[PDB]
Write an enzyme that holds these catalytic residues in place. Structure first.
Site, PDB file in Angstrom:
ATOM      1  N   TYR A 100       0.808  -1.212   0.000  1.00 24.59           N
ATOM      2  CA  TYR A 100       0.000   0.000   0.000  1.00 24.59           C
ATOM      3  C   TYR A 100       0.842   1.262   0.000  1.00 24.59           C
ATOM      4  CZ  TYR A 100      -3.075   3.767   1.141  1.00 24.59           C
ATOM      5  OH  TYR A 100      -3.729   4.970   1.063  1.00 24.59           O
TER       6      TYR A 100
ATOM      7  N   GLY B  64      -5.778   5.434  -0.717  1.00 21.02           N
ATOM      8  CA  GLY B  64      -7.149   5.443  -0.248  1.00 21.02           C
ATOM      9  C   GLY B  64      -7.985   4.398  -0.962  1.00 21.02           C
TER      10      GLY B  64
ATOM     11  N   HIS C  59      -2.484  16.217  -2.396  1.00 21.56           N
ATOM     12  CA  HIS C  59      -3.111  16.255  -1.088  1.00 21.56           C
ATOM     13  C   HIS C  59      -2.800  17.554  -0.355  1.00 21.56           C
ATOM     14  CE1 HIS C  59      -4.170  12.132  -1.894  1.00 21.56           C
ATOM     15  NE2 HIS C  59      -4.807  12.047  -0.740  1.00 21.56           N
TER      16      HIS C  59
ATOM     17  N   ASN D 149       1.279  10.410   6.439  1.00 17.42           N
ATOM     18  CA  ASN D 149       0.340   9.458   7.023  1.00 17.42           C
ATOM     19  C   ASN D 149       0.405   9.239   8.541  1.00 17.42           C
ATOM     20  OD1 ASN D 149      -1.870   7.825   6.621  1.00 17.42           O
ATOM     21  ND2 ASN D 149      -0.666   5.988   6.156  1.00 17.42           N
TER      22      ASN D 149
ATOM     23  N   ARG E 193     -13.620  27.835  47.687  1.00 21.21           N
ATOM     24  CA  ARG E 193     -13.541  26.676  48.562  1.00 21.21           C
ATOM     25  C   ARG E 193     -13.388  25.353  47.804  1.00 21.21           C
ATOM     26  NH1 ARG E 193     -18.887  26.343  51.891  1.00 21.21           N
ATOM     27  NH2 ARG E 193     -19.335  24.100  51.721  1.00 21.21           N
TER      28      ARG E 193
HETATM   29  N1  LIG Z   1      -3.962   7.923   4.836  1.00 23.08           N
HETATM   30  C1  LIG Z   1      -4.066   7.192   3.566  1.00 23.08           C
HETATM   31  C2  LIG Z   1      -4.745   8.079   2.519  1.00 23.08           C
HETATM   32  C3  LIG Z   1      -3.995   9.026   1.828  1.00 23.08           C
HETATM   33  C4  LIG Z   1      -4.599   9.817   0.857  1.00 23.08           C
HETATM   34  C5  LIG Z   1      -5.950   9.665   0.573  1.00 23.08           C
HETATM   35  O1  LIG Z   1      -6.539  10.434  -0.382  1.00 23.08           O
HETATM   36  C6  LIG Z   1      -6.483   9.781  -1.652  1.00 23.08           C
HETATM   37  C7  LIG Z   1      -6.700   8.721   1.264  1.00 23.08           C
HETATM   38  C8  LIG Z   1      -6.098   7.930   2.236  1.00 23.08           C
HETATM   39  C9  LIG Z   1      -4.896   5.922   3.774  1.00 23.08           C
HETATM   40  F1  LIG Z   1      -5.306   5.452   2.576  1.00 23.08           F
HETATM   41  F2  LIG Z   1      -5.971   6.207   4.538  1.00 23.08           F
HETATM   42  C10 LIG Z   1      -4.041   4.861   4.472  1.00 23.08           C
HETATM   43  O2  LIG Z   1      -2.805   4.967   4.615  1.00 23.08           O
HETATM   44  O3  LIG Z   1      -4.638   3.849   4.901  1.00 23.08           O
END
Ligand SMILES: *N[C@H](c1ccc(OC)cc1)C(F)(F)C(=O)O
Ligand SMILES: *N[C@H](c1ccc(OC)cc1)C(F)(F)C(=O)O
Ligand SMILES: *N[C@H](c1ccc(OC)cc1)C(F)(F)C(=O)O
Lengths: 525, 525, 526
Positions: free
Chosen positions: A52, A59, A82, A191, A297
């Site tokens: 991941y 996400g 982000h 994260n 008090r």
């Molecule tokens: N925190 C992660 C995440 C990053 C960015 C995002 O927007 C696309 C959604 C989630 C996560 F997927 F939640 C994770 O690390 O589990």
């Protein structure tokens, strides 16, 4: 030098780094156990296996499989797409607290990032390069941390003298080559709960000093009004009701009023009152009160509860600061851990709790103000502490308003840790909203300095209006000097604002409690 | 020229004066009926009869009788001792709105103040001298108005280029001699709901444009997703459910989508779907939705409710703006009125209501964002509006977060009109906290621009990602052009923050709805 | 007697009559004709198997599921069954009646395409006392509640009697009524509206107004007992200076309520008494006379006025909703079937959240007036906490104040519900109103205020005899007093108060004090 090892960092350590610009140092052991993980992990990503954030989408798009030749692009698009934070920018000290908390997480060694990332973060901290981080965007802390991760790759903005200036210029202007994000370096930087855990740290740390300062003025006030010491006797807490916080407050109140010539002992009160009763009546009216009101008090009980909440909050913050709040995680000969330690619920709750506690702290403060300002409750003082001709002059009557308004405003702040809204498809169907919780607490903490400022001024005013300065205990005189060193006595009435903000800023600096330490050796809990 | 007569002032008039720096003029009739009252009243104060605030103490100290030889001193001590405001300073436009509302109150002619006070207030407005007014202190608006009353007597501070600078310098630096407060001139300047009524005016006025702008993007979105027009047919509102607001929204939605080649009529949908059903089955599965989700169908109902609340709020503001919210009050051959028209409850409620309404407005906006961003709900669009390779790129996935966070944050804002705390002895035992209510609404309004900004961007993005630009109606193309004129299409993903704040500021300027007016003649309700 | 439910002229007051006093309901012949005709035309179109939401398609998210007309009854029936998932306490008879009444009136408007039989059944149940057992929880704003009602229409679910749920089937047989069978769109029409929040909120808003009146009544008695100034209520100060509708009304009710009082004082007298207390020698002197009284006894018009305004707004909204076609889809002769969202209770959801806030402040004011009389430093000459005998030994009303103060705090813990939308049903219901939750919140503050006011009525009455000021009370104040004293005796020695308070609270929940004034004075309260 503050050691950032992902194992022993404390809330106070964080404050020193954030507020006092203390130097940070990543231990060789941490930088070494970090290179190792990095080495093994890197050999795992070479086999283009599913990981991941390293070889998959982010996400809900985790179903999108991404080949290893997109290493740098993946991590980068993420940080850029982000960095969608909005609202005001965190203050320099707040931003530093956040960066420190992130570094400490990676320094734990389970994030499998290159040592240079930890090194580069530590450089910004040690060199004064503060990321311009917007306060809104985190669902509990992607966006806030995405603006941080940006500055490391030379993008986004940095905080220079209150405004945001392109990282590019600042970096080249300091002789620093921006980094390039490798496998899972972008994800690891953003994260986690570093935003809420960082800000939370500053808030809880300061919250504790506010309790101590609430105790200090509460103490000055009790002496100025000639209150009873009975409420703080050790037997009533250490023995009868052993709540940790209550014992601590009771102990500080006894030490603060120690050696006062104005307070009364129960024995004396009881004797004075008995001397005032005629024996030929079944029920007489006396002008003496064997006990004072709750605000003068029940201090140990109320403030103690506050303390207990702040102690529990610091605990959770300490555990969190030293945790691998990142995902996924690496271990020795173990599958790559795919969990959710990025979930800020433990801190979201902690800060929502702090918000409630601090709000009650303010409630108590404002009522003590009301008590000293009302002639039927002051126990002998003039209406609204007017020195000259009342009516013609209002004294502190107008000053009470902003304090009363703040109690009401703080009450309009609701818990955030329960306001989760499902997003990203439905992948993030339960979030914590922890950074909103942290910001809520910060606000109530800030408003409490204003309320307290009005109280510190009223107290000093009540002191030299009753002429009881020479009766104040050593700590009482210490506090009094500290107020007058900033604001003189109130003869005729005058523009109050500047005086209130003056005592307010001092309070946020710990000017009092600093005065007690320097002019006594009251060791305050 | 905006006429400030205490009788016909409107919320929009106030905005013009505050935002567009429109000139104000006190009518001769008002300035004349003001001198009269002043003349009679002044002859009443000469007889040293009891008059609150003129020959008595203030608040609880009303029992203090004050002789007429203390005329100037009384009014002055009051203004100085109540200028105890804290927190941030109101923005220039907010401060002007407040001063305008006060002048309009005195211009009604029941405050018995000298004409020069109205004149001097009008001068500051017409000359650009803005008082530096702190936001916190009012219990619903003494302190905020006390900082205003200060600048008139050459004290306190004025707002120059974002900072507060001593009134003294600024006044002498403009060739203006500070005024001297006579009988009841100090009390009249600070005794009212001008802070909450002024700010409230700006907020409701802007709230209405936000509803119109919510409607505009909602309209663009419905066309981009090929939604049904059925939900907005006049029969369903004007006839079946005649709520004023619902009818207005339904009417704007029909006009905005007017001439669109992308939307579908119920007839066509029903026919398309029927054509898709086989006659040999009792229950078939279709890929067609005869109705779209609530967020793209219940717009008239939800937004209409918002409108109704904003209409009721403007009404109360209009009545209040033109009222004698001062005390005590003067009339023709009538005893001096001693009431409490300074009590902001009517506006406190109005704004608490606006806060709730606007919060639901945001809730609806954010879900539409969620709808367009989720591939299972977009009705044909790519996941998170990604142009290129999803997974590798996240598109608007990160942009949704700040919008979702804001809905949650707005929800942590509680009503203030019920948080009354007793003060000033117990004289002010029931207050309204209206300015906190106004500030609450302002915040939710501000956060809504950010949510809306994300929606405006997603919509435009969905337009050129589906290639449905040539099908958009005239208003739809107008809105689309306005977004791209600020932010280009999203190819690869990139730093989102700047783009969101860009569309956000434009929204707070009414850039859209301004674009519809200039590029159509949609007259939007 | 009989109320007319024509889907066009129903009032909140008429709804209360049908609900609270069992007033007979009657659907007009004109409405029946419009229903019968709409049904025949609608039937002709449903009979052609064309797609119509909820008639020949699945519900909510499953609208993509096309259903053949041969499934007409089953479709509607599975809907009512599977949606009767309410939980929690059952509404009382009066609340459930207002709900069914609001539902009947909606369908009576004629755009629901329901057979007149359903209109007939609902009205039968109301006129014959067949009350559905309606669980309070479970609507997102009102499927669950209405589904339980629709159930009793087809012989299923439960009916409420003696406070307990009893199987509908049994009840129908024990009355000769033969269960109906849901046809095209009839199940959907019965449950797809805002009748839950609208019916309940009507009862609440109506009572809220009576509570405003009774608050003004007791406030007037108190003002007379402590001899406050009449000046704050002078017409010129509202009708002219600050024309807020509700403010003008309150000011007027107060003037009418205190008319003929020998206890109240006029500003003129106050200043004259205050100037004769002043000695020409000193510039700043202390006086024990208050030319003005605390906000709690001077800002009544402003505060109660605001509450009134809010209530006038909610009643207005409720009136429009009561006579609305809050259902979907809708039939409009000579037009395509309307597919919208008139089932969305946002407008009422908002209105009730406002009433909750408004009533909360009404309670704050009452609370502080209680504090006013009980505090010797503020009561203007009364003994501490209204103790008639020896204080300290006796606490008097000291303890009575707590349940009232505690209630102000409880009302403040109730937050708006209309903004708490949680997306459900596969994101199809992505924005809802939770209006029924808002209405129950309002009912709660209403209920709590009766308790706060009860303590205030007891205190006022007690303040009267303690000061021997009964003979100086106006005609209305004597009426109020005697009304209280008829329920609870003056407070001599300390005694158990709980029963005395619940007694006056009940009297307040049924407009007793507002009735005392109607039968003892010539006063017409706004
Ligand atoms: N925190 C992660 C995440 C990053 C960015 C995002 O927007 C696309 C959604 C989630 C996560 F997927 F939640 C994770 O690390 O589990
Ligand atoms: N608004 C008046 C007021 C001014 C200042 C003050 O602090 C001493 C208290 C009250 C008022 F007294 F409330 C009034 O005009 O009625
Ligand atoms: N109110 C309809 C509805 C009924 C039942 C349900 O649960 C499956 C969801 C929604 C409606 F679909 F909302 C409508 O009539 O539009």
């Amino acid at each position: 030098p503050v050691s950032v090892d992902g194992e022993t960092l404390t809330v106070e350590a964080v404050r020193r780094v954030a507020e006092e610009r203390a130097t940070v140092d990543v231990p060789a052991e941490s930088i070494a156990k970090a290179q190792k993980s990095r080495e093994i992990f890197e050999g795992i990503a070479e086999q283009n296996i599913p990981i991941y954030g390293v070889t998959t989408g982010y996400g809900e798009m985790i179903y999108m499989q991404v080949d290893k030749s997109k290493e740098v692009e993946l991590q980068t698009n993420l940080v850029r797409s982000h960095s969608a934070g909005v609202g005001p920018l965190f203050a320099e000290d707040e931003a530093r607290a956040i960066v420190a908390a992130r570094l400490n997480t990676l320094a734990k060694g389970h994030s499998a990032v290159r040592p240079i990332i930890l090194e580069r973060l530590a450089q910004y901290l040690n060199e004064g390069i503060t990321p311009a981080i917007p306060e809104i965007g985190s669902l509990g802390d992607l966006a806030p941390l995405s603006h941080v991760a940006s500055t490391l790759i030379g993008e986004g903005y940095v905080l220079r003298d209150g405004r945001p200036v392109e990282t590019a210029q600042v970096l080249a202007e300091r002789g620093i080559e921006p980094l390039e994000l490798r496998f899972k370096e972008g994800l690891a930087l953003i994260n986690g709960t570093s935003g809420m855990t960082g800000l939370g740290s500053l808030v809880v740390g300061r919250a504790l000093e506010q309790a101590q300062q609430a105790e200090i003025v509460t103490a000055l006030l009790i002496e100025a009004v000639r209150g009873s010491t009975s409420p703080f006797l050790a037997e009533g807490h250490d023995i009868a009701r052993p709540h940790e916080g209550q014992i601590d407050t009771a102990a500080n109140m006894r030490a603060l009023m120690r050696g006062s010539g104005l307070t009364v002992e129960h024995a004396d009160l009881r004797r004075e009152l008995q001397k005032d009763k005629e024996a030929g009546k079944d029920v007489q009216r006396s002008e003496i009160y064997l006990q004072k009101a709750y605000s003068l008090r029940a201090i140990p009980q109320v403030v103690g509860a506050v303390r207990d909440t702040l102690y529990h909050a610091r605990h959770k913050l300490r555990i969190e600061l030293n945790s691998a709040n990142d995902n996924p995680l690496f271990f020795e000969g173990k599958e790559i851990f795919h969990g959710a330690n990025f979930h800020g619920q433990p801190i979201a709750f902690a800060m929502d709790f702090v918000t409630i506690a601090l709000t009650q702290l303010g409630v108590l403060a404002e009522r003590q103000i009301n008590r000293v300002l009302n002639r039927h409750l002051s126990y002998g003082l003039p209406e609204f502490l007017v020195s000259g001709d009342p009516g013609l002059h209002s004294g502190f009557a107008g000053a009470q308003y902003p304090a009363t308004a703040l109690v009401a405003e703080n009450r309009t702040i609701g818990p955030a840790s329960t306001q989760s809204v499902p997003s990203n498809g439905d992948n993030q169907d339960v979030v914590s909203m922890g950074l909103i919780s942290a910001r809520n607490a910060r606000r109530v903490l800030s408003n409490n300095n204003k309320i307290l400022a009005v109280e510190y001024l009223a107290a000093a005013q009540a002191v030299d209006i009753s002429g009881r300065f020479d009766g104040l205990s050593p700590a009482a005189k210490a506090t009094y000097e500290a107020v007058r060193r900033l604001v003189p006595t109130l003869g005729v009435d005058r523009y109050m604002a500047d005086d209130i903000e003056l005592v307010a800023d001092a309070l946020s600096r710990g000017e009092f409690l600093r005065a007690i330490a320097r002019e006594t050796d009251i060791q305050l809990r």
